[PDB]
Amino acid sequence: KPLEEAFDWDEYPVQRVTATGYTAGAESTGKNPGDPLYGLTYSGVKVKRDLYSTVAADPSVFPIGTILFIPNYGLGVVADTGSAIKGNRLDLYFETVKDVYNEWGKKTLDVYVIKKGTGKITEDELEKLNETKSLQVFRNQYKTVK
Amino acid sequence: KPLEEAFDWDEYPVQRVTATGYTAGAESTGKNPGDPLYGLTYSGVKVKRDLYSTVAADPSVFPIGTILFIPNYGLGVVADTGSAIKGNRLDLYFETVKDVYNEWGKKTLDVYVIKKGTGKITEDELEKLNETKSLQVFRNQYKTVK
Numbered sequence: 001k002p003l004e005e006a007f008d009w010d011e012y013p014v015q016r017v018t019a020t021g022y023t024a025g026a027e028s029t030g031k032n033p034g035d036p037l038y039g040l041t042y043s044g045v046k047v048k049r050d051l052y053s054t055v056a057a058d059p060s061v062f063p064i065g066t067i068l069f070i071p072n073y074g075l076g077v078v079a080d081t082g083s084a085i086k087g088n089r090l091d092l093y094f095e096t097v098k099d100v101y102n103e104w105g106k107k108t109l110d111v112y113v114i115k116k117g118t119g120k121i122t123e124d125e126l127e128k129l130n131e132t133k134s135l136q137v138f139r140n141q142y143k144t145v146k
Numbered sequence: 147k148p149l150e151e152a153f154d155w156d157e158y159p160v161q162r163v164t165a166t167g168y169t170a171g172a173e174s175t176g177k178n179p180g181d182p183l184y185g186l187t188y189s190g191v192k193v194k195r196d197l198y199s200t201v202a203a204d205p206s207v208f209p210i211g212t213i214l215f216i217p218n219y220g221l222g223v224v225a226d227t228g229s230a231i232k233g234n235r236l237d238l239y240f241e242t243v244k245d246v247y248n249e250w251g252k253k254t255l256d257v258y259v260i261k262k263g264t265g266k267i268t269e270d271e272l273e274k275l276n277e278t279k280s281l282q283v284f285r286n287q288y289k290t291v292k
């Protein structure tokens with residue numbers, strides 16, 4: 001039986017947060033494996049994924065040592081910080097980048113099938129779709145470059 | 147308007163899928179910058195985040211060239227494949243790992259505050275938490291090692 005179902009968690013105080021995953025790797029921490037500080041959180045404990053996992057928070061909201069229950073992740077102990085983790089934000093530790101993508105990022109949803117493909121697509125065809133005139137009004141919401 | 151609001155998308159066929167994000171990088175693709183095929187999808191087109199972005203699918207479900215609308219991502223053209231991308235699965239291209247974490251992975255949710263911290267946590271404390279006797283029954287769901 002899941003821990004989510006094993007207690008009446010709504011008896012505890014609740015905080016709405018925005019949560020992402022992170023790993024010890026350089027994408028997240030700037031550190032490389034081989035650095036003696038690799039895996040070391042702000043609190044001084046090493047990152048861990050277990051029954052109680054290390055998470056990052058803003059210590060002004062959740063002090064270091066705070067225990068949280070995060071549905072679909074598990075029990076967390078606030079052990080780390082981050083420059084983007086301010087306010088009602090959490091970063092949940094996962095061992096690998098793929099684990100973040102798969103265990104936190106995977107979402108079931110409906111998508112709409114606009115046109116079935118033929119089995120091939122060219123650069124020119126992709127460019128022409130991107131230049132669709134009637135849709136240019138929407139486009140700057142999707143490009144990364146200003 | 148958001149594109150999500152601009153058209154009656156429910157007039158199109160719909161498919162329920164499970165979707166994740168990916169990048170061109172090695173964690174997703176096994177390739178590194180400098181590799182001849184770096185940034186190139188199965189179809190041969192370069193990865194792209196734009197009005198119409200390149201996505202990965204199982205060609206048995208969505209042939210290459212299929213146009214999709216994916217809420218909270220955008221229009222997609224099926225251009226890529228992947229080893230785990232089987233059945234009703236999509237992988238959505240993002241330029242960077244952080245963009246996957248932040249633009250696909252970020253979830254707003256309620257978390258439960260079990261115990262406010264004191265400002266410190268030690269390895270021994272974390273170990274004690276993880277050894278909690280009454281919670282051992284749940285613990286194997288959170289460890290990666292069998």
Ligand SMILES: CC(=O)N[C@@H]1[C@@H](O)[C@H](O)[C@@H](CO)O[C@H]1O
Nearest residue numbers: 028029039040041042081082083
């Ligand atoms: C696991 C890890 O390296 N965590 C680091 C932590 O050491 C540092 O104090 C904090 C500063 O914001 O940035 C985190 O990414």
Ligand SMILES: CC(=O)N[C@@H]1[C@@H](O)[C@H](O)[C@@H](CO)O[C@H]1O
Nearest residue numbers: 170175185186187188227228229
């Ligand atoms: C952008 C990118 O490199 N995509 C690759 C693609 O080249 C390869 O054909 C396919 C095999 O499943 O794996 C994808 O990750």
Ligand SMILES: C[C@@H](O)CO[C@@H](C)CO[C@@H](C)CO
Nearest residue numbers: 170179183184185186192193
């Ligand atoms: C953007 C990143 O995926 C790098 O892309 C490789 C294919 C280099 O792109 C070509 C357009 C260089 O002429």
